Design a protein around this ligand. Structure first.
Ligand code: CLA
Ligand code: CLA
Ligand code: CLA
Ligand code: CLA
Ligand code: CLA
Ligand code: CLA
Ligand code: CLA
Ligand code: CLA
Ligand code: CLA
Ligand SMILES: CC1=C(/C=C/C(C)=C/C=C\C(C)=C\C=C\C=C(C)\C=C\C=C(C)\C=C\C2=C(C)CCCC2(C)C)C(C)(C)CCC1
Ligand code: SF4
Ligand SMILES: [Ca+2]
Lengths: 165, 74, 74, 80, 37, 733, 144, 74
């Protein structure tokens, strides 16, 4: 398929790797009894391994010649061959949480900046204001775009300190 | 018979001893800087040590060089 | 022979660590480079780039170097 | 020898002279500040370059500057 | 031809390693400590 | 009192301490900082230095040729260049015992010799050298040329021979002569040598100075060139069964563009190289008539610079005044030259390993590894030098009043934005590459290799598919048979090129995977961080908020004292100093990647690299620990072999590196106090105080300490990696 | 005010001696001599290490560099409220008075002093290095 | 961690202060500059951080090597 890779559901090395992991786990399990805590723990780990391999093959991931999955970072290839869940959707998810945290911190700084002692509000966190801004940050992309359109997101050149060149 | 415990215990106690020795030197220097008073140490052992500190350091430096040569050169 | 050589290595490293710590203890108040080191305290970075450079003249820096030598020795 | 210079921003606070450990700086009369005094460096031949005077200067930017020059016996602070 | 003799390394290696460096070191050391008039 | 040394600095000569010798040795080439230095004298001194350097280079080349002709086995290596190891020179060491003598006695010699890794054998054999007489004649000729250059360097400093100041500033004439003469005529002469000597010698015909005036390089004899039927020169080329050095299957063509590599030597065709040099010679000669010097026609670089300002005012004044700030600043020209040279050096390393130009060079694995690593480290040092000289230009030769509103002033206008964005790129690359590596390491440690993140490098693989590689399956541009780009080269060079790029047995566009993607990101991190340190040091060299007057202190100075919280490593020299470590680390990563990928390719198991290059444990165990077993076994209680010298060099580099750590961690003050105690000890010792010093012993300066520690760090780093690389590649193959 | 004359027959503080004393520079290049007047006997700290006892009245000491003499001067002024003064002595016997230069300490302003090495401008008003390039030797933009 | 120590032991706070100034400019542009002015670590703090990381990295390296080896073959 893409870049000479084969799907994990039809790769021989993938199945051999799964059999290798299950074989070493079963080999470690043969030394214990049947109704003991280590045996139950090993069986739980084996079930987790089976579920993980089944879920990875079910997701349609592309495996290589080593039997391990590969991620598709190109937006066109991901949206064209059903690989948007690898690197596209998590990218936008991180962008939302990253801008979320950044906007919450920026709002807290700008809010405490006009007070009498901002340094005290920086070392001793004002939990009520921080909690209110944390709950209000859900609309961070909308607020950031509206701030950018109004011209209030950036500071002017004359109000920023610079070197003597 | 537990080689792991023996090796780990020896190494751990040795490291603690070395760190404590370095701390001892540090606090000796702290005392010499803050709590030392020359009005009560006119002609005692500490004053004489400070008086010939150059000789002490020079001989210790020479023995360090001699030991380094005869230890690493081999 | 190997035991003899490694024992001399240990003695040399111990002597160097002692040299750094003892030098930082005896020369903590004053030295031939800075006669008023006691006025600068126990823990200070330097006395400026003057006199060719006075980087790490405090007793704290001697403890800092003794830590590395103790690590090497141990 | 090192080059020690005094600029016109000196407020005559006399802190740089007290911080000098080899008696290089001094105070002379002046008419550019309220204290009517100004720092001077007439014995730069004895300066080592410790920059204690720069540390003790409170003006922004500094009024006393030290530039490392030719090294000698007095400038290197050697007792031998 | 330009081929050196068989004994050439046995004479040029000790020369370049002991004769030339000693003479060069002594000459340079004397030159550095020369006092100006 | 005042000493004679140094003669260029009376202030340093009056220094009565040991600092005088070190500073005089480290400031001898700083011509601008001497006593009584003018512009004309400065340029003349640089001219003499250039001649002396050229003489040294030519003498070194002649020495290599002479030693290969004397103690080497070039006459026997040409007959069997696959199973015979090249010999560098003999070894005459009285310290060697009997086992060392028989251990180093290899390569068919009669005594202890060194096996060369420089690759001069393949290069000389490809250009036409066959007998030792040729090497001897070349060595004698190069020695005489070096002597002439030395005499020229001495002659140009005497009166009636010193060039004027205006002569050194003739940019138009110098650039026209270098583009047309030093570049075009030299390339044309090389084409003449390839067509007249290299091509006939590779086909079994000995052509030398005694018979080249009577042997025709082509059966048509210059007629198709004058009649414009140049296509007749590419007729009847070397067939696929041609044997290098003999006439078996040899063609009669002299200028072709078959492409690919030779089937036997696995190197570039000589006819294609000759055709290449001819085309670039024509291009360089034509480009040599672009600037107006003395005949009215041509251009003026000042006019082209001043006539390149956008009307929107985006670049401010554009390039106005750039001609004066560059022609009058030697540091700017040196920085530009070093930047271009470093980039070209990296280009040379990549093109030589991927496209082997010398015969039987691909089979020599040690030659490839050593040459690539050598050129990459040299390029890294040269790049750091380019940025260092740029900082020197800002501190010493920048004039804000002359460069008002141009691109140069606008660089310092928004330097904070540049440093901030470089910091963001470096931070992002470092966090992500380290995070992915640690994640893969944890997955491999927990027994779940399928859980690690392996991003397929689809962009570089897409580029490879565009070049003609069909392994991925994109099938476009040169990969698709119905494309115009593919059908337009099928009659000129695409057959050989496609046959060579699709073959997985060469180094021409190797297959890449997630490990290659990750290590490429590490390379990008190293490049961006090194650029960040160098760029920040060059832009902040004239001053910042911490030191508003850093331009008045020079390029290199210790610090500004402990005031204002501390000003350690505030000069631009210190920025370069911290950047050298990042350059060494970046080149270390690129050379590690090259060595491991090629080692796994030569061993026939590329899957080992593809599966262990995603986690750092694989790099530490399967590459650094697995390939050093033979290196550290050079000498042991059971005896020694020829690999003991590399083991000694390995430990030597480790010792030098650790010694550099001392100058890097411990600082001056402690050492000065210790020295004072030693001074007292010597002055108060009988039978020894009679011998007094002529220079007062003092501790090394801060700048000198940084330089000494950096030098030891770099020397140990280079020697350690070179020893490990050569030992592992030589023992494995 | 008159420049003081060095009295070599001046009693010295009772000190047992140390290894941080004078070196060959005191006999080959120069050395320094610090003198002061003490109202009573008192144990003080030597700048080269050790504790000495300053005598009542005149007290003289020898040091290798000027920094040691000024450090002892500062210690005596700030801990015991005295007025010390020092000279630089050459091997030929020449004595040169150094501090205080005019008899008045430099922290306070005194009439008759002339300011030297003073720039009647600020740091930001200095010229670029390109303007001071190609001089007789390495010259900083602040030297002019 | 050990190699991380080399970042604090081979460099100085002046470079880091200027780099922090550039980062502060980036913050000031987007009005995200904290009221507490970010200052680089002090010289003494840089030395302490470097020696702490050096000791932790080396000691942890030897600890892992000794424990893994003595547990596997002991
Ligand atoms: C971050 C850098 C980056 C890089 C290095 C690439 C690289 C690539 N992209 Mg791309 N892309 C990017 C960002 C990037 N993209 C972003 C941010 C977006 C969101 C707008 C897209 C959305 C996108 C689409 C929709 C497509 C690609 C495609 C491609 C591949 C070929 C096209 C091309 O090179 O032109 C650059 C790509 C663009 C300018 C986007 C427009 C698509 C162009 C016009 C190509 C479409 C023509 C045709 C489908 C090509 C296929 C020929 C053949 C294989 C059938 C190539 C490997 C194509 C592909 O291979 O499909 C799987 C494809 O159709 N990308
Ligand atoms: C009985 C033991 C003892 C005691 C009571 C003291 C007491 C004191 N020491 Mg001292 N010292 C000791 C041992 C001791 N020390 C040892 C063993 C060493 C060698 C390392 C030192 C070296 C030393 C120096 C160099 C200095 C002191 C100083 C001081 C004084 C200030 C307190 C302080 O350090 O600041 C606060 C304490 C801290 C900030 C704790 C630091 C935390 C460290 C860095 C973390 C350790 C790593 C940890 C083990 C691993 C964690 C893993 C990580 C992933 C979380 C204080 C009176 C200082 C001083 O003289 O004051 C002027 C001084 O500069 N000590
Ligand atoms: C492997 C690196 C290295 C080496 C070789 C040294 C070496 C030395 N250190 Mg050092 N140190 C290091 C790392 C190193 N250190 C680091 C990283 C730090 C930072 C924490 C320090 C901090 C430090 C301090 C604080 C002190 C030293 C001191 C010393 C000296 C001790 C005297 C001695 O050992 O006698 C013998 C010398 C050696 C063993 C060095 C190697 C000599 C070789 C083996 C001999 C070869 C001779 C050869 C024939 C020469 C021919 C040359 C030819 C080309 C002509 C010694 C020269 C102490 C000192 O000043 O001296 C008392 C001191 O107090 N070091
Ligand atoms: C510092 C450690 C060290 C020591 C103890 C030795 C010792 C020795 N080496 Mg060796 N070597 C060393 C380091 C060392 N080496 C290093 C670091 C290297 C690598 C560069 C080498 C490389 C090397 C080579 C290549 C060779 C040796 C050889 C030798 C042997 C003979 C050397 C000789 O005869 O010279 C002569 C020595 C002297 C003239 C002076 C001796 C010092 C005297 C005894 C001290 C006097 C002080 C006295 C106490 C003062 C009293 C005070 C007053 C009351 C009088 C010898 C046993 C040779 C060998 O292999 O032998 C088989 C030889 O071939 N070494
Ligand atoms: C820069 C080139 C170069 C280099 C790196 C070497 C290196 C070497 N030569 Mg070789 N040599 C060279 C050029 C060179 N040679 C040339 C051009 C000739 C022809 C005249 C010779 C003739 C020669 C002979 C006959 C022998 C060597 C031998 C050797 C080896 C022993 C050490 C030695 O220096 O011997 C001596 C080197 C010379 C006599 C050449 C010096 C003559 C040139 C013109 C002087 C150059 C001055 C220099 C640039 C100034 C700066 C150097 C320094 C002062 C800073 C050594 C590996 C010996 C050997 O084979 O060991 C096994 C040996 O017997 N060489
Ligand atoms: C770079 C050039 C160079 C050369 C050519 C030599 C050559 C030699 N070295 Mg030497 N060495 C060197 C560098 C060099 N070394 C360096 C850089 C170091 C420091 C790492 C050493 C450290 C060293 C040691 C420790 C020893 C040697 C020894 C020897 C001798 C080997 C003994 C032997 O088996 O033969 C047979 C021996 C003989 C035939 C006796 C010859 C007597 C001398 C060497 C020649 C006559 C002296 C001559 C008149 C004076 C020359 C001085 C001149 C510069 C003015 C040999 C002649 C060994 C030795 O000295 O032998 C006892 C030994 O102990 N070397
Ligand atoms: C056609 C006339 C001509 C020619 C042939 C030259 C030639 C040269 N001039 Mg010159 N010059 C000229 C006219 C000319 N000049 C005029 C008219 C002026 C006055 C306006 C000047 C003013 C001038 C100055 C001020 C200087 C020179 C210098 C030089 C030397 C440069 C040294 C060098 O970089 O190596 C040669 C460089 C190359 C051959 C180009 C290499 C191209 C890339 C980098 C390499 C690619 C090639 C290939 C891939 C590598 C080979 C691989 C393998 C074989 C190893 C060089 C020999 C310098 C000098 O004097 O040195 C003593 C210098 O300072 N010239
Ligand atoms: C065409 C190349 C070129 C040229 C002409 C120059 C020219 C100049 N440089 Mg420069 N530079 C270059 C490339 C170049 N550089 C490169 C590639 C780097 C990166 C490494 C640098 C980094 C650099 C810095 C940081 C500085 C200069 C400076 C200077 C100026 C004077 C200092 C000097 O050279 O004195 C003489 C040079 C030396 C004495 C070299 C020092 C000794 C080294 C460390 C040798 C160590 C090697 C070691 C012994 C190897 C042996 C190992 C073995 C024994 C095991 C001068 C105009 C200085 C300056 O501008 O002054 C303000 C300055 O500070 N350069
Ligand atoms: C292994 C050693 C090491 C490491 C990791 C670094 C790392 C870094 N260097 Mg550095 N450097 C080093 C050695 C090292 N250096 C040495 C020896 C020198 C020569 C003195 C330099 C000189 C140097 C300069 C001059 C500069 C850097 C810069 C940087 C930063 C580059 C940005 C980046 O890549 O983001 C990635 C971030 C990281 C890799 C940080 C590590 C992330 C950690 C492991 C995560 C935290 C762990 C966990 C969550 C919490 C554990 C803590 C626990 C106590 C609770 C980066 C943090 C540049 C810079 O500042 O960039 C702006 C800069 O200008 N370096
Ligand atoms: C600091 C400083 C400086 C600067 C420096 C620098 C700037 C460096 C760098 C850098 C570098 C080192 C760069 C480089 C670059 C490169 C480039 C820019 C390129 C490119 C590309 C292209 C354009 C291509 C294209 C293509 C392709 C894609 C492929 C195929 C072919 C073709 C052609 C199509 C100086 C000294 C001046 C002075 C001032 C200061
Ligand atoms: S500290 Fe600065 S402002 Fe105050 S007197 Fe001295 S030079 Fe003038
Ligand atoms: Ca021939």
């Amino acid at each position: 398929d893409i870049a000479g890779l084969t799907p994990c559901s039809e790769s021989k090395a993938y199945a051999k790797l799964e059999k290798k992991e299950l074989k070493t786990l079963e080999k470690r399990l043969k030394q214990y009894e049947a109704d003991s805590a280590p045996a139950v723990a090993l069986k739980a780990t084996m079930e987790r391994t089976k579920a993980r391999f089944a879920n990875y093959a079910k997701a349609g991931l592309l495996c290589g010649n080593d039997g391990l999955p590969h991620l598709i970072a190109d937006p066109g290839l991901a949206l064209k061959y059903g690989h948007a869940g690898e690197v596209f959707i998590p990218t936008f998810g991180f962008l939302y949480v990253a801008g979320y945290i950044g906007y919450v911190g920026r709002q807290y700084l700008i809010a405490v900046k006009g007070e009498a002692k901002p340094t005290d509000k920086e070392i001793i966190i004002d939990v009520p204001l921080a909690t209110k801004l944390a709950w209000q940050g859900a609309g961070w992309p909308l607020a950031a775009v509206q701030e950018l359109q109004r011209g209030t997101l950036l500071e002017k050149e004359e109000n920023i300190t610079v070197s003597p060149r | 018979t537990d080689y792991g415990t023996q090796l780990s215990l020896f190494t751990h106690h040795t490291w603690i001893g070395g760190f404590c020795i370095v701390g001892a030197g540090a606090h000796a220097a702290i005392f010499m800087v803050r709590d030392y008073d020359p009005t009560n140490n006119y002609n005692n052992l500490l004053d004489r040590v400070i008086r010939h500190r150059d000789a002490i350091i020079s001989h210790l430096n020479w023995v360090c060089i001699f030991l380094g040569f005869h230890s690493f050169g081999l | 022979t190997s035991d003899f050589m490694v024992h001399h290595i240990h003695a040399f490293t111990i002597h160097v660590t002692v040299l750094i710590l003892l030098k930082g203890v005896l020369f903590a108040r004053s030295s031939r480079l800075i006669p008023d080191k006691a006025n600068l305290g126990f823990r200070f970075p330097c006395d400026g780039p003057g006199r060719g450079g006075t980087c790490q003249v405090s007793a704290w820096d001697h403890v800092f170097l003794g830590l590395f030598w103790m690590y090497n020795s141990l | 020898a090192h080059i020690v210079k005094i600029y016109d921003t000196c407020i005559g606070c006399t802190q740089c002279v007290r911080a000098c450990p080899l008696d290089v700086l001094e105070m002379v009369p002046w008419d550019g500040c309220k204290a009517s005094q100004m720092a001077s460096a007439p014995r730069t031949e004895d300066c080592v370059g410790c920059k204690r005077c720069e540390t003790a200067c409170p003006t922004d930017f500094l009024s006393v500057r030290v530039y490392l020059g030719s090294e000698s016996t007095r400038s290197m602070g050697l007792s031998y | 031809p330009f081929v050196p003799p068989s004994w050439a390394p046995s004479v040029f290696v000790p020369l370049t390693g002991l004769v030339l460096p000693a003479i060069a070191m002594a000459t340079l050391f004397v030159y550095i400590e020369k006092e100006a008039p | 009192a005042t000493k004679l040394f140094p003669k260029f600095s009376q202030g340093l000569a009056q220094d009565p301490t040991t600092r005088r010798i070190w500073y005089g040795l480290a400031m001898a080439h700083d011509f601008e900082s001497h006593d009584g230095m003018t512009e004309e004298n400065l340029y003349q001194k640089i001219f003499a230095s250039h001649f002396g350097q050229l003489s040294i280079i030519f003498l070194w080349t002649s020495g290599n040729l002479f030693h290969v002709a004397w103690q080497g086995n070039f006459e026997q290596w040409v007959t069997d260049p696959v199973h015979i190891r090249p010999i560098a020179h003999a070894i005459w060491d009285p310290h060697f015992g009997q086992p060392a003598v028989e251990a180093f006695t290899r390569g068919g010699a009669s005594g202890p010799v060194n096996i060369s890794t420089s690759g001069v054998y393949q290069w000389w054999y490809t250009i036409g050298m066959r007998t030792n007489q040729d090497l001897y004649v070349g060595s004698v000729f190069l020695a005489l040329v070096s002597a002439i250059f030395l005499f020229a360097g001495w002659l140009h400093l005497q009166p009636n021979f010193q060039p004027s100041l205006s002569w050194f500033k003739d940019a138009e004439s110098r650039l026209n002569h270098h583009l047309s003469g030093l570049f075009g005529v030299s390339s044309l002469a090389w084409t003449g040598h390839l067509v007249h000597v290299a091509i006939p010698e590779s086909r079994g015909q000995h052509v030398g100075w005694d018979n080249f005036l009577s042997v025709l390089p082509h059966p048509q004899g210059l007629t198709p060139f004058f009649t414009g039927n140049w296509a007749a020169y590419a007729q009847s080329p070397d067939t696929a069964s041609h044997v290098f050095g003999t006439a078996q299957g040899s063609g009669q063509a002299i200028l072709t563009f078959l492409g690919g590599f030779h089937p036997q030597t696995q190197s570039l065709w000589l006819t294609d190289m000759a055709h290449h040099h001819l085309a670039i010679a024509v291009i360089f000669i034509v480009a040599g008539h672009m600037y107006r010097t003395n005949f009215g026609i041509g251009h003026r670089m000042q006019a082209i610079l001043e006539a390149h300002t956008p009307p929107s005012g985006s670049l401010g004044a554009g390039h106005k005044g750039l001609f004066d700030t560059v022609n009058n600043s030697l540091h700017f020209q040196l920085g530009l030259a070093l930047a271009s040279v470093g980039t070209i050096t990296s280009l040379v390393a990549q093109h030589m390993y991927s496209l082997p130009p010398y015969a039987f060079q691909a089979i020599d694995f040690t030659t490839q590894a050593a040459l690539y690593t050598h050129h990459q480290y040299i390029a890294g040092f040269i790049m750091c030098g380019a940025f260092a000289h740029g900082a020197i230009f800002f501190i010493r030769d920048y004039d804000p009043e002359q460069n008002k509103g141009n691109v140069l002033a606008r660089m310092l206008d928004h330097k904070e934005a540049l440093i901030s964005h470089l910091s963001w790129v470096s931070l992002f690359l470092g966090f992500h590459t380290l995070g992915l590596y640690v994640h893969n390491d944890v997955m491999q440690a927990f027994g779940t290799p399928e859980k690690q993140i392996l991003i397929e490098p689809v962009f570089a693989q897409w580029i490879q598919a565009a070049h003609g590689k069909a392994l991925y399956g994109f099938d476009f541009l040169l990969s698709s048979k119905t494309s115009a780009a593919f059908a337009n080269g099928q009659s000129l060079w695409l057959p050989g090129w496609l046959d060579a790029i699709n073959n997985n047995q060469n180094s021409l566009f190797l297959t890449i995977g997630p490990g290659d993607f990750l290590v490429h990101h590490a390379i990008a991190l190293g490049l961006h961080t090194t650029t960040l340190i160098l760029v920040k040091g060059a832009l902040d060299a004239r001053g910042s908020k911490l030191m508003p007057d850093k331009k008045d202190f020079g390029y290199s100075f210790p610090c500004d004292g402990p005031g204002r919280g501390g000003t350690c490593d505030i000069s631009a020299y210190d920025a370069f100093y911290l950047a050298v470590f990042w350059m060494l680390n970046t080149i270390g990563w690129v050379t590690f990647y090259w060595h491991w990928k090629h080692l796994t390719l030569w061993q026939g198991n590329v899957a080992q690299f593809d599966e262990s290059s995603t986690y750092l444990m694989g790099w530490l165990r399967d590459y650094l620990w697995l390939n050093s077993s033979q290196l550290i076994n050079g000498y042991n209680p059971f005896g020694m072999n020829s690999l003991s010298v590399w083991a000694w060099t390995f430990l030597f580099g480790h010792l030098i590196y650790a010694t550099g750590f001392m100058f890097l961690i411990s600082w001056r003050g402690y050492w000065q106090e210790l020295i004072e105690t030693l001074v007292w000890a010597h002055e108060k010792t009988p039978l020894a105080n009679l011998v007094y010093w002529k220079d007062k012993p003092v501790a090394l300066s801060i700048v000198q300490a940084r330089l000494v520690g950096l030098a030891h760090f770099s020397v140990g780093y280079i020697f350690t990696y070179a020893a490990f690389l050569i030992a592992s590649t030589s023992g494995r193959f | 005010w008159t420049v003081p004359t060095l009295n070599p027959d001046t009693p010295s503080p009772i000190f047992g001696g140390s290894t941080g004393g004078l070196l060959r520079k005191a006999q080959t290049e120069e050395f320094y001599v610090i003198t002061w007047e003490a109202k009573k006997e008192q144990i003080f700290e030597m700048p080269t290490g050790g504790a000495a006892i300053m005598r009542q009245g005149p007290n003289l000491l020898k040091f290798g560099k000027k920094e040691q003499c000024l450090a002892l001067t500062t210690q005596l002024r700030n801990k015991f409220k005295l007025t010390p003064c020092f000279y630089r002595v050459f091997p030929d016997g020449k004595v040169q008075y150094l501090h205080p230069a005019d008899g008045v300490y430099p922290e306070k302003v005194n009439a008759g002093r002339v300011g030297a090495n003073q720039n009647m401008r600020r740091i930001g008003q200095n010229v670029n290095p390109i303007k001071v390039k190609f001089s007789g030797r390495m010259m900083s933009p602040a030297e002019i | 961690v050990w190699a991380f120590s080399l970042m604090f032991l081979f460099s100085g706070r002046g470079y880091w202060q200027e780099l922090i100034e550039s980062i502060v400019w980036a913050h000031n542009k987007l009005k995200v500059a904290p009221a507490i002015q970010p200052r680089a670590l002090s010289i003494t703090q840089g030395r302490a951080v470097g020696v702490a990381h050096y000791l932790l990295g080396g000691i942890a390296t030897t600890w892992s090597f000794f424990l893994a080896r003595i547990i596997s073959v002991g």
